[PDB]
Amino acid sequence: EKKYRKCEKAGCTATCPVCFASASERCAKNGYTSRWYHLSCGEHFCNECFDHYYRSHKDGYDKYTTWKKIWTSNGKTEPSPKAFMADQQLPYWVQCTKPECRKWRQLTKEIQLTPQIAKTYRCGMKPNTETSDHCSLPEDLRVLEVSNHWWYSMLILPPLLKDSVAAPLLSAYYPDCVGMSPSCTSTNRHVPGMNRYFQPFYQPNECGKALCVRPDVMELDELYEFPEYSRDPTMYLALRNLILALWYTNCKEALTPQKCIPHIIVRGLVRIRCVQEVERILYFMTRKGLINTGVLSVGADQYLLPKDYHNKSVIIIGAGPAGLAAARQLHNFGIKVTVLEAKDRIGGRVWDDKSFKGVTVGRGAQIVNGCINNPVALMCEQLGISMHKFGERCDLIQEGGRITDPTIDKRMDFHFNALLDVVSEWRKDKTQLQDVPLGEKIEEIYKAFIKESGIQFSELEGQVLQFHLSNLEYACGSNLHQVSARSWDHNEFFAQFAGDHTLLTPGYSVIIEKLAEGLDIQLKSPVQCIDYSGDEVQVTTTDGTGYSAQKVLVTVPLALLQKGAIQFNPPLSEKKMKAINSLGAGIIEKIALQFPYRFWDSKVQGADFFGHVPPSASKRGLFAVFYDMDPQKKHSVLMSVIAGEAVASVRTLDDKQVLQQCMATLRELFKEQEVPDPTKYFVTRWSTDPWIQMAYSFVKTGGSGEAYDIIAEDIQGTVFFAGEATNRHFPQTVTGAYLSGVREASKIAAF
Ligand SMILES: [C]C1=C([C])[C]=C2C(=[C]1)N=[C@]1([C]([C][C]=O)C3=[C][C]=C(Br)[C]=[C]3)C(=O)[N]C(=O)N=C1N2[C][C]([O])[C]([O])[C]([O])[C]OP([O])(=O)OP([O])(=O)O[C][C]1O[C](N2[C]=NC3=C2N=[C]N=C3[N])[C]([O])[C]1[O]
Numbered sequence: 001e002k003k004y005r006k007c008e009k010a011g012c013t014a015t016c017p018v019c020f021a022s023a024s025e026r027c028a029k030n031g032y033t034s035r036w037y038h039l040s041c042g043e044h045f046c047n048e049c050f051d052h053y054y055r056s057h058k059d060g061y062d063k064y065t066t067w068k069k070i071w072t073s074n075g076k077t078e079p080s081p082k083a084f085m086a087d088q089q090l091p092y093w094v095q096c097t098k099p100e101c102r103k104w105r106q107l108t109k110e111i112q113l114t115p116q117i118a119k120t121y122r123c124g125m126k127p128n129t130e131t132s133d134h135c136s137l138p139e140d141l142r143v144l145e146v147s148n149h150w151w152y153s154m155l156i157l158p159p160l161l162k163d164s165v166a167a168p169l170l171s172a173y174y175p176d177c178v179g180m181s182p183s184c185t186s187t188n189r190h191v192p193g194m195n196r197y198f199q200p201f202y203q204p205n206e207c208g209k210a211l212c213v214r215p216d217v218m219e220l221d222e223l224y225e226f227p228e229y230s231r232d233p234t235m236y237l238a239l240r241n242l243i244l245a246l247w248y249t250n251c252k253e254a255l256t257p258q259k260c261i262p263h264i265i266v267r268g269l270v271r272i273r274c275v276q277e278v279e280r281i282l283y284f285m286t287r288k289g290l291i292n293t294g295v296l297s298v299g300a301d302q303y304l305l306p307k308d309y310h311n312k313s314v315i316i317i318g319a320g321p322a323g324l325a326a327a328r329q330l331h332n333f334g335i336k337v338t339v340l341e342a343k344d345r346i347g348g349r350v351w352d353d354k355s356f357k358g359v360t361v362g363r364g365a366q367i368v369n370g371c372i373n374n375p376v377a378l379m380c381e382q383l384g385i386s387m388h389k390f391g392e393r394c395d396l397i398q399e400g401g402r403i404t405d406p407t408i409d410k411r412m413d414f415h416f417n418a419l420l421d422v423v424s425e426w427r428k429d430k431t432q433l434q435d436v437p438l439g440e441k442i443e444e445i446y447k448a449f450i451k452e453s454g455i456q457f458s459e460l461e462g463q464v465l466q467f468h469l470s471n472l473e474y475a476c477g478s479n480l481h482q483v484s485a486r487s488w489d490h491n492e493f494f495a496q497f498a499g500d501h502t503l504l505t506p507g508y509s510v511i512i513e514k515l516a517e518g519l520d521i522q523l524k525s526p527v528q529c530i531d532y533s534g535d536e537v538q539v540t541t542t543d544g545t546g547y548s549a550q551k552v553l554v555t556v557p558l559a560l561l562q563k564g565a566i567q568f569n570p571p572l573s574e575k576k577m578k579a580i581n582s583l584g585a586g587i588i589e590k591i592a593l594q595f596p597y598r599f600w601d602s603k604v605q606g607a608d609f610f611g612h613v614p615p616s617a618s619k620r621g622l623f624a625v626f627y628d629m630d631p632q633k634k635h636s637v638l639m640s641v642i643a644g645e646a647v648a649s650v651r652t653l654d655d656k657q658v659l660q661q662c663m664a665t666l667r668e669l670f671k672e673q674e675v676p677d678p679t680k681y682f683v684t685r686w687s688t689d690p691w692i693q694m695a696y697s698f699v700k701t702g703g704s705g706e707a708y709d710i711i712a713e714d715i716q717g718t719v720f721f722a723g724e725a726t727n728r729h730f731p732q733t734v735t736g737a738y739l740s741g742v743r744e745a746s747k748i749a750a751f
């Protein structure tokens with residue numbers, strides 16, 4: 001036969017291929033062979049070692065055949081001698097852990113790389129074990145080759161990771177389809193101790209779950225950033241999935257390259273490319289706020305992004321969830337941030353009262369709707385605090401004291417949802433200019449249904465239907481006659497947060513205060529003018545104090561944008577003003593009442609809340625739901641909500657008059673017994689708080705969900721916008737406001 005000195009592959013850069021396997025007694029070593037098999041520009045094996053495993057009469061055949069059976073039953077990747085070599089025989093490479101050295105070294109071929117070796121390796125030391133004379137030695141010349149893109153081009157098979165920390169979460173997938181080795185026995189074997197709200201990965205063919213990622217498909221922004229993985233995403237996916245698994249395994253500390261590296265176990269020079277790449281992917285996912293986020297804090301020179309991204313200054317207007325999320329992100333990235341807040345406190349529509357004995361009572365937000373993958377649940381895990389999952393039970397108690405039979409509750413809910421289904425059908429072919437108020441469409445459909453069907457409802461059934469109507473006015477923050485029939489539920493077209501609905505028992509203020517800790521926050525500093533006509537943005541407060549930065553982030557409430565309280569120079573565009581004015585500034589108010597004892601326990605029997613059947617439509621929304629504010633059933637605090645048309649009715653009532661109406665309502669709801677006087681209470685006035693004037697946004701008649709995106713659009717890469725009224729997928733909530741701030745910090749840090 002004819003022998004060859006050179007590699008089989010045209011264009012391979014190895015002038016002298018050497019065999020890494022040396023498995024056969026006739027291994028060609030560094031000389032001639034019938035074929036030099038190419039794995040990479042730095043790695044080859046001779047035909048004698050190929051046959052050692054491949055041919056049925058050679059000594060390596062039993063090992064190759066046993067591997068082969070495991071490979072083909074567990075994965076979708078073809079078996080071959082090359083795949084076998086890369087998975088089983090190619091030597092490992094590891095970095096010196098001396099911080100001033102970090103040189104790559106090849107381990108001898110029988111040394112199995114472990115995390116422990118990757119954490120403790122030093123040049124010249126026996127693995128798993130002097131001076132530092134061996135650190136000075138040059139790296140093998142093949143190491144530098146790996147950093148070029150053409151090296152990856154010439155790598156014939158994608159790497160497959162071993163014992164990935166992501167593997168227990170990915171058992172429904174073929175391992176090689178997510179970049180993991182099919183021969184790995186721990187890969188192919190709820191991560192215990194991981195928070196059950198952390199479900200980072202979609203199961204196969206799954207959708208409809210907010211913030212899950214497909215472990216087997218790259219997203220578009222990943223492809224824009226890493227287009228070299230468009231053809232074969234295997235290697236990128238394994239590193240991204242590993243990073244997510246590690247972050248959600250320990251979300252209380254910054255995830256760094258050095259923490260990831262011992263968990264990257266794969267043979268060959270390609271491990272060098274994997275380690276170089278994991279660092280780039282880490283910075284990308286950090287900037288996007290997918291890891292290293294929440295209430296994580298850093299010190300100086302422990303910034304989360306390298307000093308490149310640091311070269312900016314930012315003024316943030318408003319210190320609510322959105323403003324503080326952006327400030328925490330940007331500060332952690334190493335960017336200079338100043339927060340200007342109009343009020344004498346931080347938090348915005350997060351404002352907790354800590355003066356009720358034994359409980360924390362939000363004047364503003366206190367519920368989390370859907371905890372799975374929710375950043376609020378992440379931050380609770382980081383802070384070690386607990387939430388209370390709501391029970392389903394909610395008796396509808398009538399004035400006079402009767403409890404509504406639950407079959408009436410369900411029946412009238414059935415009828416109410418049927419009306420919304422007709423609206424859903426009616427709108428399928430309607431343009432924005434053909435929009436109709438939801439409340440008007442509902443009332444029309446209902447009257448037509450009574451006429452057509454002839455059905456006769458009791459007075460109680462009609463009042464219970466009014467209750468279900470009031471729940472939707474509560475969710476929208478408005479009487480439905482101002483809400484768009486086309487677009488009221490626009491956001492439900494996107495994946496929503498799954499899982500538990502909870503009461504944030506310790507209060508969102510705990511999270512707000514931790515986000516803000518250590519930041520440069522200026523209270524009682526209402527911004528009056530933002531001028532971005534110069535080289536730097538000029539921000540002036542109402543007392544004439546001037547601030548300047550390269551970029552500015554506006555997070556003020558939608559109602560304050562509608563009233564134009566900040567003057568912009570140049571002015572906001574006509575298109576931006578139309579979007580701003582197409583959304584509604586929804587409103588609810590709250591009352592909280594402390595009592596000497598839990599007078600409701602005998603009748604309510606531990607339920608988290610009870611409903612209040614409205615006696616007339618004129619009273620829809622007036623204290624419709626009462627919340628028991630102690631899930632441990634020890635303290636006696638109720639909270640109730642004023643929603644819909646009821647908000648206008650309490651506008652000209654002072655607090656004592658509201659309290660009096662609420663106590664008259666409670667004594668009607670508990671007419672058969674005595675109700676004690678309250679000993680402490682508050683009544684909120686969000687609608688007249690000058691710097692807020694609302695509770696949460698909704699889409700007004702004629703508007704579109706697209707308005708949320710338009711408000712979110714930056715101006716000139718210089719003026720950015722966040723807040724709950726800028727989050728199209730997740731409007732209204734603390735969660736969506738938080739995510740909007742993280743989003744804007746990502747935009748700002750990219751420049
Ligand atoms: C009452 C209430 C309120 C008010 C709110 C809320 C609530 C309540 N809650 C809630 C809701 C949602 C919806 O859905 C609900 C309801 C019911 C149920 Br059953 C469920 C739920 C809850 O609970 N949760 C949540 O999540 N949320 C809520 N809410 C709402 C919230 O709160 C919101 O969203 C947030 O907060 C937002 O955030 P932002 O966006 O950030 O905002 P604020 O907070 O407002 O902040 C802002 C700021 O800014 C300032 N400013 C203005 N202007 C100005 C300023 N500064 C400066 N300068 C100027 N010029 C103000 O002050 C504030 O702070």
Ligand SMILES: [Zn+2]
Pocket residue numbers: 019020021022023024026027028029045046047048049
């Ligand atoms: Zn050989």
Ligand SMILES: [Zn+2]
Pocket residue numbers: 007008009012013014017037038039040041043044
């Ligand atoms: Zn080659």
Ligand SMILES: [Zn+2]
Pocket residue numbers: 096097098101102103122123134135136
């Ligand atoms: Zn070294």
